[PDB]
Design an enzyme around this catalytic site. Structure first.
Site, PDB file in Angstrom:
ATOM      1  N   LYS B  62      46.329 -88.504  78.088  1.00 44.13           N
ATOM      2  CA  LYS B  62      44.864 -88.378  78.220  1.00 44.13           C
ATOM      3  C   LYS B  62      44.392 -87.134  77.484  1.00 44.13           C
ATOM      4  O   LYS B  62      43.624 -86.342  78.014  1.00 44.13           O
ATOM      5  CB  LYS B  62      44.460 -88.328  79.699  1.00 44.13           C
ATOM      6  CG  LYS B  62      44.607 -89.643  80.417  1.00 44.13           C
ATOM      7  CD  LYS B  62      43.338 -90.437  80.253  1.00 44.13           C
ATOM      8  CE  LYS B  62      43.492 -91.906  80.566  1.00 44.13           C
ATOM      9  NZ  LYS B  62      44.262 -92.623  79.508  1.00 44.13           N
ATOM     10  N   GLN B 175      43.851-102.186  90.709  1.00 48.24           N
ATOM     11  CA  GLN B 175      42.465-101.785  90.551  1.00 48.24           C
ATOM     12  C   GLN B 175      41.493-102.962  90.545  1.00 48.24           C
ATOM     13  O   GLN B 175      40.292-102.746  90.503  1.00 48.24           O
ATOM     14  CB  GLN B 175      42.309-100.952  89.272  1.00 48.24           C
ATOM     15  CG  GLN B 175      43.031 -99.621  89.311  1.00 48.24           C
ATOM     16  CD  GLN B 175      42.856 -98.878  88.007  1.00 48.24           C
ATOM     17  OE1 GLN B 175      41.708 -98.583  87.608  1.00 48.24           O
ATOM     18  NE2 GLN B 175      43.939 -98.595  87.316  1.00 48.24           N
ATOM     19  N   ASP B 178      42.091-108.795  86.307  1.00 53.09           N
ATOM     20  CA  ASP B 178      42.847-110.037  86.226  1.00 53.09           C
ATOM     21  C   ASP B 178      43.576-110.131  84.894  1.00 53.09           C
ATOM     22  O   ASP B 178      42.950-109.944  83.862  1.00 53.09           O
ATOM     23  CB  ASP B 178      41.875-111.243  86.349  1.00 53.09           C
ATOM     24  CG  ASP B 178      42.582-112.560  86.225  1.00 53.09           C
ATOM     25  OD1 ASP B 178      43.307-112.927  87.172  1.00 53.09           O
ATOM     26  OD2 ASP B 178      42.429-113.229  85.187  1.00 53.09           O
ATOM     27  N   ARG B 193      51.220-100.286  89.582  1.00 47.42           N
ATOM     28  CA  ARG B 193      51.578-100.491  90.999  1.00 47.42           C
ATOM     29  C   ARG B 193      51.905-101.934  91.365  1.00 47.42           C
ATOM     30  O   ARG B 193      52.811-102.153  92.193  1.00 47.42           O
ATOM     31  CB  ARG B 193      50.459 -99.960  91.887  1.00 47.42           C
ATOM     32  CG  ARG B 193      50.426 -98.443  91.922  1.00 47.42           C
ATOM     33  CD  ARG B 193      49.111 -97.955  92.542  1.00 47.42           C
ATOM     34  NE  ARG B 193      48.019 -98.108  91.573  1.00 47.42           N
ATOM     35  CZ  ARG B 193      46.732 -97.920  91.834  1.00 47.42           C
ATOM     36  NH1 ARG B 193      46.335 -97.590  93.066  1.00 47.42           N
ATOM     37  NH2 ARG B 193      45.833 -98.074  90.873  1.00 47.42           N
TER      38      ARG B 193
HETATM   39  N1  LIG Z   1      45.482 -94.583  81.172  1.00 47.13           N
HETATM   40  C1  LIG Z   1      44.592 -95.177  82.014  1.00 47.13           C
HETATM   41  C2  LIG Z   1      43.260 -95.262  81.624  1.00 47.13           C
HETATM   42  C3  LIG Z   1      42.379 -95.929  82.478  1.00 47.13           C
HETATM   43  O1  LIG Z   1      41.157 -96.126  82.182  1.00 47.13           O
HETATM   44  N2  LIG Z   1      42.843 -96.468  83.629  1.00 47.13           N
HETATM   45  C4  LIG Z   1      44.137 -96.328  84.007  1.00 47.13           C
HETATM   46  O2  LIG Z   1      44.496 -96.857  85.074  1.00 47.13           O
HETATM   47  N3  LIG Z   1      45.018 -95.695  83.213  1.00 47.13           N
HETATM   48  C5  LIG Z   1      46.432 -95.556  83.627  1.00 47.13           C
HETATM   49  O3  LIG Z   1      46.994 -96.874  83.647  1.00 47.13           O
HETATM   50  C6  LIG Z   1      47.836 -97.048  84.800  1.00 47.13           C
HETATM   51  C7  LIG Z   1      47.215 -98.056  85.755  1.00 47.13           C
HETATM   52  O4  LIG Z   1      48.239 -98.287  86.736  1.00 47.13           O
HETATM   53  P1  LIG Z   1      47.972 -99.300  87.968  1.00 47.13           P
HETATM   54  O5  LIG Z   1      46.538 -99.165  88.398  1.00 47.13           O
HETATM   55  O6  LIG Z   1      48.265-100.697  87.476  1.00 47.13           O
HETATM   56  O7  LIG Z   1      48.957 -98.780  89.005  1.00 47.13           O
HETATM   57  C8  LIG Z   1      47.963 -95.668  85.407  1.00 47.13           C
HETATM   58  O8  LIG Z   1      49.089 -94.993  84.793  1.00 47.13           O
HETATM   59  C9  LIG Z   1      46.691 -94.959  84.991  1.00 47.13           C
HETATM   60  O9  LIG Z   1      46.876 -93.540  84.932  1.00 47.13           O
END
Ligand SMILES: Nc1cc(=O)[nH]c(=O)n1[C@@H]1O[C@H](COP(=O)(O)O)[C@@H](O)[C@H]1O
Ligand SMILES: Nc1cc(=O)[nH]c(=O)n1[C@@H]1O[C@H](COP(=O)(O)O)[C@@H](O)[C@H]1O
Lengths: 215, 215
Positions: B62, B175, B178, B193
């Site tokens: 990031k 989150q 889909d 996750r």
């Molecule tokens: N880089 C990201 C940008 C973003 O907008 N959303 C996000 O979830 N991530 C990353 O993607 C992964 C989502 O993982 P999960 O929600 O499927 O567990 C995590 O590593 C977040 O830090």
């Protein structure tokens, strides 16, 4: 902060980072450590600095992910011994609250970054910065970061956060900011290259402090 | 990307991260590693994953500091073996260009993050996201990240970057996003996750892939 001066230790070699920090320790008791040093030498470098220098450590980790990931980053950073962590406000209130919650659990502090010091900050961050600051106030944030390179912005930030909030400011020296002018609004200045790339870092720190005492 | 599926490996323990990644490796040849794992286990974890699994590694760092600091972070990250690094666009064009320059020097790739997937992204990032994407296009960025949780935003992003650009998308599963809907616009999905906290990660990955094949 001793002498209102925070060292930004962005050397990427442990030997050089330890030498320079040791040389300027009489002038500076707070060190900001970021990813250039941590990614090169490991998170163990934080506890090493804390033990060797007895300084406070601010982790400049510009935290800027989703709330769940921010939680994990903050917990790893405080586990490693950092006193405080710098967090971006641009990702919004839930991302900041995640960091605040871990800091509350672990007895540590969050610094909210509201506007950045480099030229590109004008493109997107500057237009959101007042609102980011107000969000900080509404979340109960007491520690902020704003830009030495734009003292009129730093004055506006100070106006939003009030006189009791603690405000630190990078961009002094290499990026063009002035110590004295910045300290009209900030409580402390952050200085990296002007000290750590100097032929004599102790002399560079001492020169800055001499100009600070005069205020 | 094998099966259009990228594993987000955010477990913070080397043993657990290695177990889960090994279990799902038949389904996934690209792993996203971020700070939760790197700050807990060290940057050496990247080369370990690359050797053990023969996967591509995207560093989800990031990146969001000033140009000079971004340079150092990118060089440390590529030195550690990462194939690509995810960079925030919100800090502006000079901060992104600094990462692009190091990627060009080291034969690696930058992914530009234009809008984030979490609720707080609506506060400041979403309003800048189209412009961040257009900035990417004008800088020659070819790889982008956008949110599974807002497929209408992901459609708009795709519209700006065009069909030749590569677009990956987090926010699938936990989150609320889909797989199938997200893959209408993105080339690959990122899943953390829903796989790595599953009782059977291989079964979770296989279930996602089965729903991807059907498209
Ligand atoms: N880089 C990201 C940008 C973003 O907008 N959303 C996000 O979830 N991530 C990353 O993607 C992964 C989502 O993982 P999960 O929600 O499927 O567990 C995590 O590593 C977040 O830090
Ligand atoms: N955290 C920061 C926010 C910011 O807006 N500007 C900035 O320079 N920094 C950091 O402060 C230090 C400035 O160092 P220098 O310009 O004095 O070398 C570097 O570590 C930057 O990454």
């Amino acid at each position: 902060v001793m002498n209102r001066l925070i060292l930004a230790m962005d050397l990427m070699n442990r030997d050089d980072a330890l030498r320079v920090t040791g040389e300027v320790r009489e002038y500076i008791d707070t060190v900001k450590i970021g990813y250039p040093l941590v990614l090169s030498e490991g998170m163990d470098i934080i506890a090493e600095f804390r033990k060797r220098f007895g300084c406070r450590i601010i982790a400049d980790f510009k935290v800027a992910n989703i709330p769940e990931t921010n939680e994990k980053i903050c917990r790893a950073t405080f586990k490693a011994g950092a006193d405080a962590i710098i967090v971006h406000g641009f990702p919004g209130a839930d991302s900041v609250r995640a960091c605040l919650n871990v800091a509350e659990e672990m007895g540590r502090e969050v610094f909210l970054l509201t506007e950045m010091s480099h030229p590109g900050a004008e493109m997107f961050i500057q237009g959101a910065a007042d609102e980011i600051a107000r969000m900080g106030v509404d979340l109960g944030v007491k520690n902020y970061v704003g830009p030495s390179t734009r003292p009129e912005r730093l004055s506006r930030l100070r106006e939003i956060i009030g006189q009791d909030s603690f405000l630190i400011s990078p961009g002094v020296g290499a990026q063009g900011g002035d110590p004295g002018e910045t300290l009209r609004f900030a409580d402390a200045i952050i200085v990296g290259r002007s000290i750590y790339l100097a032929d004599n870092p102790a002399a560079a720190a001492a020169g800055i402090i001499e100009s600070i005492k005069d205020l």
